[PDB]
């Protein structure tokens, strides 16, 4: 119901955020950000809570050499919450996911940002810590 609000989005296309679920992937080469019309010369950028296409660069060879959807869960670029607290996360991080928002993994190492948790429920269910 209640919609997202924009947040300072510090993952341009070209990032390798570390996969923080138990798949067997280690990295997630963001090749594109979902739901970006975009402008000339401008890199598509995914903050936290953003869907994303993601090649795996290192990990299991099942996953390597193909594209998966993914979600950004933490991010090192400090966004501002509506309550006027800026927040950043120590590492950029995501999870491999399917089109309809379900995880293909099962358990999320590390904390998930609540911008991502509220917007992705199945991620939120497998997230131990939030914010």
């Amino acid at each position: 119901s209640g919609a997202k609000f924009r947040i300072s989005l510090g993952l341009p296309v070209g990032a390798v955020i570390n996969c923080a679920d138990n798949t067997g992937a280690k990295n997630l080469y963001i090749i594109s950000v979902k739901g970006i019309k975009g402008r000339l010369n401008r890199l598509p950028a995914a903050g936290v809570g953003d869907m994303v296409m993601a090649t795996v660069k290192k990990g299991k060879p099942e996953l390597r050499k193909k594209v998966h959807p993914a979600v950004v869960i933490r991010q090192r670029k400090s966004y501002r919450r509506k309550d006027g607290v800026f927040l950043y996360f120590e590492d950029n991080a995501g999870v491999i996911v399917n089109n309809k928002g379900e995880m293909k993994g099962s358990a999320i190492t590390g904390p998930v940002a609540k911008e991502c948790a509220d917007l992705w429920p199945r991620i939120a269910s497998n997230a131990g810590s939030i914010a």
Binding site: R74, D83, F86, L87, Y88, F89, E90, T109, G110, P111
Partner: protein
């Protein structure tokens, strides 16, 4: 508006100001300003640093 305390210095942090850090261990710190946060990230033991609350408690200043 729950005023929080700076995880380095000890000062209160009013709603507007400062910044919130979320380490992957899964615990969070609040910093009044960057000055605190830099000493935190460079691993300065705030009890060694005069102007913090933790130092002055340690050295029994005031009272």
């Amino acid at each position: 508006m729950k005023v929080e305390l700076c995880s380095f210095s000890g000062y209160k942090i009013y709603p507007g100001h400062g910044r919130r850090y979320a380490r992957t261990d899964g615990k969070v710190f609040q910093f009044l300003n960057a000055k605190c946060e830099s000493a935190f990230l460079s691993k300065r033991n705030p009890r060694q640093i005069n102007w913090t609350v933790l130092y002055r408690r340690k050295h029994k200043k005031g009272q």
